[model samples]
Target: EIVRTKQKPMDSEEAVLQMNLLGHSFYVYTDAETNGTNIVYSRKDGKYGLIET
Candidate 1:
């Protein structure tokens, strides 16, 4: 019998960073307004995604 393990979902922040750095070209802003401890990135199409740490 073979068991398949499910892949863990990427963290919001990591996803955002990767999308921005690799997929797009945007800098992450971790300011108090954005809660101060998180990862955020912009999509190639100019969308935004963020993850709280």
Candidate 2:
């Protein structure tokens, strides 16, 4: 399912916090510094992985 919402651009740290709060597998957000789109996801190692575009 695809849901559309107006998400404000934020840094990776903020994205991670949002992901944890939402308890989602992944979070998509626009980078605050780069202004490029990115994905921050939860991994098995208990750390986050960033996918930059």
TM-score per candidate, chains pooled: 0.31, 0.82
Backbone clashes (count) for model 1: 0
Root-mean-square deviation per candidate? 10.0, 4.2
Clash pairs for candidate 2: none
Give the local distance difference test score of model 2: 0.88
In model 1, pairs of residues that clash are: none
User: What are the per-residue Cα lDDT tens digits for candidate 1 across 1-53?
Assistant: 22235472344555455554556554343445444555566556767856565
The digit string of per-residue lDDT tens for model 2 on 1-53 reads 23367667889999888888888989988999899999999889988899998
Which residue segments of model 2 deviate by more than 4 Å?
1-7
Residue 37 Cα positional deviation in candidate 1, in Å, after optimal superposition? 1.6
